Amino acid sequence: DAFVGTWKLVSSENFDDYMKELGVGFATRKMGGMAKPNCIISVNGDVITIKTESTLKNTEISFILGQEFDEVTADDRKVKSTITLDGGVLVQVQKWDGKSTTIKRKREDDKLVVECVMKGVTCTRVYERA
Ligand SMILES: CCCCCCCCCCCCCC(=O)O
Numbered sequence: 001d002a003f004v005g006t007w008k009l010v011s012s013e014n015f016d017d018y019m020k021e022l023g024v025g026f027a028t029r030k031m032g033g034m035a036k037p038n039c040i041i042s043v044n045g046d047v048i049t050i051k052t053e054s055t056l057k058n059t060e061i062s063f064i065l066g067q068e069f070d071e072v073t074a075d076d077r078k079v080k081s082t083i084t085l086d087g088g089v090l091v092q093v094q095k096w097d098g099k100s101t102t103i104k105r106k107r108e109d110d111k112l113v114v115e116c117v118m119k120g121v122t123c124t125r126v127y128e129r130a
Pocket residue numbers: 019024028029031032033035039052056057073074075103114116125
């Protein structure tokens with residue numbers, strides 16, 4: 001849809017703080033902090049795939065909107081994830097150990113804007129088409 005494409009990270013604010021609030025240790029925060037991943041989003045019927053590719057790590061999720069799935073995150077959390085579409089925004093929630101974080105992906109002009117929230121910390125990442 002609006003989301004399908006190959007996207008490259010162009011900007012990020014507060015991602016270290018976000019990773020810290022998730023419990024990510026220093027070595028992994030250091031690897032994530034200056035990573036400039038690509039995000040490849042595709043759809044085949046009911047099934048949406050999001051690949052995230054960077055020099056040191058590749059991850060992938062495939063899902064159906066509104067159906068919970070098990071996910072291993074890039075920082076090795078084992079989470080239960082659910083993704084829905086709300087007003088054109090893809091809203092992902094991850095739940096583990098009684099905690100939750102939300103990742104919202106939205107299309108704005110030329111950009112794919114991703115907002116990640118954990119407790120009082122909000123991170124914003126912007127991608128542009130590769
Ligand atoms: C190898 C570096 C891994 C860094 C671990 C980061 C923690 C996972 C949070 C990912 C939030 C997704 C944001 C996005 O799609 O831009």
